[PDB]
Design an enzyme around this catalytic site. Structure first.
Site, PDB file in Angstrom:
ATOM      1  N   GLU A 135       1.075  -1.217   0.460  1.00 14.56           N
ATOM      2  CA  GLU A 135      -0.329   0.092   0.024  1.00 14.56           C
ATOM      3  C   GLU A 135       0.741   1.002   0.125  1.00 14.56           C
ATOM      4  O   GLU A 135       1.784   1.617   0.528  1.00 14.56           O
ATOM      5  CB  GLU A 135      -1.031  -0.483   1.521  1.00 14.56           C
ATOM      6  CG  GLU A 135      -1.932  -0.979   0.820  1.00 14.56           C
ATOM      7  CD  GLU A 135      -2.837  -0.597  -0.265  1.00 14.56           C
ATOM      8  OE1 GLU A 135      -3.546   0.647  -0.520  1.00 14.56           O
ATOM      9  OE2 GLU A 135      -3.156  -1.729  -0.979  1.00 14.56           O
ATOM     10  N   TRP A 136      -0.008   2.539  -0.379  1.00 18.33           N
ATOM     11  CA  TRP A 136       1.312   3.318  -1.088  1.00 18.33           C
ATOM     12  C   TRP A 136       1.254   3.856  -0.082  1.00 18.33           C
ATOM     13  O   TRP A 136       2.367   4.507   0.274  1.00 18.33           O
ATOM     14  CB  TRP A 136       0.025   4.408  -1.483  1.00 18.33           C
ATOM     15  CG  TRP A 136      -0.879   5.006  -0.845  1.00 18.33           C
ATOM     16  CD1 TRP A 136      -1.769   4.585  -0.975  1.00 18.33           C
ATOM     17  CD2 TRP A 136      -0.814   6.136   0.360  1.00 18.33           C
ATOM     18  NE1 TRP A 136      -2.808   4.843   0.244  1.00 18.33           N
ATOM     19  CE2 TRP A 136      -2.757   6.146   0.696  1.00 18.33           C
ATOM     20  CE3 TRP A 136      -0.323   7.220  -0.041  1.00 18.33           C
ATOM     21  CZ2 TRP A 136      -2.974   6.670   1.432  1.00 18.33           C
ATOM     22  CZ3 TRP A 136      -0.442   8.521   1.331  1.00 18.33           C
ATOM     23  CH2 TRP A 136      -1.667   8.152   1.630  1.00 18.33           C
ATOM     24  N   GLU A 144      -0.883 -18.803   0.216  1.00 19.02           N
ATOM     25  CA  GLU A 144      -2.003 -19.956   0.196  1.00 19.02           C
ATOM     26  C   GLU A 144      -2.378 -20.534  -1.230  1.00 19.02           C
ATOM     27  O   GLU A 144      -3.076 -20.174  -2.369  1.00 19.02           O
ATOM     28  CB  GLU A 144      -3.434 -18.116   0.125  1.00 19.02           C
ATOM     29  CG  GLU A 144      -3.439 -17.891   1.679  1.00 19.02           C
ATOM     30  CD  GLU A 144      -4.578 -17.952   1.915  1.00 19.02           C
ATOM     31  OE1 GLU A 144      -5.943 -17.617   1.433  1.00 19.02           O
ATOM     32  OE2 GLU A 144      -5.046 -16.826   3.311  1.00 19.02           O
ATOM     33  N   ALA A 173      -8.432 -21.697  11.706  1.00 19.49           N
ATOM     34  CA  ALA A 173      -9.855 -22.473  12.393  1.00 19.49           C
ATOM     35  C   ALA A 173     -11.156 -21.516  11.696  1.00 19.49           C
ATOM     36  O   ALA A 173     -11.736 -21.259  12.559  1.00 19.49           O
ATOM     37  CB  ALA A 173      -9.716 -22.995  13.445  1.00 19.49           C
ATOM     38  N   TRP A 216      -8.604 -13.360  13.611  1.00 20.37           N
ATOM     39  CA  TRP A 216      -8.648 -12.110  11.846  1.00 20.37           C
ATOM     40  C   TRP A 216      -9.484 -11.832  11.819  1.00 20.37           C
ATOM     41  O   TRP A 216     -10.945 -12.457  11.906  1.00 20.37           O
ATOM     42  CB  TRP A 216      -8.660 -13.332  10.803  1.00 20.37           C
ATOM     43  CG  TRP A 216      -8.420 -12.867   8.926  1.00 20.37           C
ATOM     44  CD1 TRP A 216      -9.450 -12.127   8.944  1.00 20.37           C
ATOM     45  CD2 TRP A 216      -6.993 -12.120   8.840  1.00 20.37           C
ATOM     46  NE1 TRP A 216      -8.830 -11.746   7.543  1.00 20.37           N
ATOM     47  CE2 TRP A 216      -7.688 -11.737   7.222  1.00 20.37           C
ATOM     48  CE3 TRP A 216      -6.040 -12.095   9.247  1.00 20.37           C
ATOM     49  CZ2 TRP A 216      -7.157 -10.501   6.698  1.00 20.37           C
ATOM     50  CZ3 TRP A 216      -5.034 -11.759   8.346  1.00 20.37           C
ATOM     51  CH2 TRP A 216      -5.245 -11.487   6.779  1.00 20.37           C
TER      52      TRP A 216
END
EC number: 3.2.1.14
Length: 424
Positions: free
Chosen positions: A49-50, A119, A190, A337
């Site tokens: 990101e900038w 991933e 999970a 998360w």
């Protein structure tokens, strides 16, 4: 116990009250904060990101308010895909270029370690050889991290990894026993067990199987994923149980059939803030008006529905249930998360700021030659109070005490710490 919390660098772009900004960071809330994400350019670590460089300083600047706090930088994620990992790990030279860049980058920006979020090795476009090459990557980083700590004098950079719960992904990319010896901790993802890719309603993050499930589906739950990582070689003390502060949403075929397993025609309506059909932040679901909330009895997690919309999500009760389980299994703590998906600003759920993550915080607070020629028994961990060493026929094992218990040589057991006598 660890509380590992993910920060996301695109949450700054959400509108209105959902906008997550530097002020919204709480340096006392978690033990470990991880920055998602960094990317890779010509096999070297790079910003995505900038304004990352500005955000890094705010981020690690949190350590001035809490210097117990450790920070890590995550690389990869959904958007990254796989090809850059595949190209970097292929040759020992490319790996080398990355490892050195990684060390330079993390010191330059005041990060305390690196979190690998590929991933996934061996899935999608990633070839079968990426499974063993990922082991090699992890080894190399662990190696180079160790030598930097001798040479530089400072504390060794931490190395963690975010790892999938599905057996198909685990089998295809993860030599669990090997990588676990090198990783400081292992962040188990999970969640995303069920979602609108499937034709029927299912919970994003159920604790146990449902009675009626069979085949592979019987392992699509937190408990099975944990046992999977344990049985395949992860020390419990290193296994960090991920929790989601988002739920996954369905459009029902019919508003009259709202059961777990009911026919669904696709993703649920995008949330007003997250704008991603199939998911909803906790702050988008917690205060749904005129809805009907229910708990899945076997799976110990709730779902909510209203008209033709059905969402499985996690609440305060389910996070408490998951931490109990976690401690009952001797896991190293909880991962979440993500920060910006909890009600970080207390604007929606009438439960204060970070009600989910605070729940975790509260509930978490309630060699090879050494054992020869020792007799079979228990010995203390000189570096640690809540761990100990068991010798069995010359062979060393490392075990942890239950949460809130310490090892005393007087009982050769884990027990209560000594009581004070009217002290300060």
């Amino acid at each position: 116990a660890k509380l590992v919390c993910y920060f996301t660098n695109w949450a700054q772009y959400r509108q209105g009250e959902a906008r997550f900004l530097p002020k919204d960071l709480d340096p006392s809330l978690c033990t470990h904060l991880i920055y998602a994400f960094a990317g890779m350019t010509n096999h070297q670590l790079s910003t995505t990101e900038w304004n990352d460089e500005t955000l890094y300083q705010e981020f690690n600047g949190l350590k001035k308010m809490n210097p117990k706090l450790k920070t890590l930088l995550a690389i990869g994620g959904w958007n990254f895909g796989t090809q850059k990992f595949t190209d970097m790990v292929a040759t020992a030279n490319n790996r080398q270029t990355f490892v050195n860049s990684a060390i330079r980058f993390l010191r330059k920006y005041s990060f305390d370690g690196l979190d690998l979020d590929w991933e996934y090795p061996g899935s999608q476009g990633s070839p079968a050889v990426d499974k063993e090459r990922f082991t090699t990557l992890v080894q190399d980083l662990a190696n180079a991290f160790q030598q930097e700590a001798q040479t530089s004098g400072k504390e060794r950079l931490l190395l963690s990894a975010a790892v999938p719960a599905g057996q198909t992904y685990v089998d295809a990319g993860y030599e669990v026993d090997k990588i676990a010896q090198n990783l400081d901790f292992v962040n188990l993802m999970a969640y995303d067990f069920h979602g609108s890719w499937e034709k029927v309603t299912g919970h994003n993050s159920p604790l146990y199987k449902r009675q009626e499930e069979s085949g592979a589906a019987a392992s699509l739950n937190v408990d099975a994923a944990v046992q999977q990582w344990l049985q395949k070689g992860t020390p419990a003390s290193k296994l960090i149980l991920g929790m989601p502060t988002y739920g996954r949403s369905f459009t029902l075929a019919s508003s009259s059939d709202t059961r777990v397993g009911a026919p669904a025609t696709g993703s649920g309506t995008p949330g007003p803030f997250t704008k991603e059909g199939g998911m909803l932040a906790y702050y988008e679901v917690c205060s749904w008006k005129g809805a009907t909330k229910q708990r899945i009895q076997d799976q110990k997690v709730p779902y909510i529905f209203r008209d033709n919309q059905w969402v499985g999500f996690d609440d305060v009760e389910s996070f408490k249930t998951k931490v109990s389980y976690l401690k009952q299994k001797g896991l190293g703590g909880a991962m979440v998360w993500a920060l910006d998906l909890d009600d970080f600003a207390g604007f929606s759920c009438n439960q204060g700021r970070y009600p989910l993550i605070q729940t975790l915080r509260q509930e978490l607070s309630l060699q090879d030659t050494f054992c020869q020629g020792k007799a079979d028994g228990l010995y203390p961990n000189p570096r640690e109070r809540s761990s100990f060493y068991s010798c069995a026929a010359g062979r060393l094992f490392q075990q942890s005490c239950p949460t809130g218990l310490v090892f005393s040589n007087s009982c050769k057991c884990c027990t209560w710490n000594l009581v004070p006598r009217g002290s300060l």
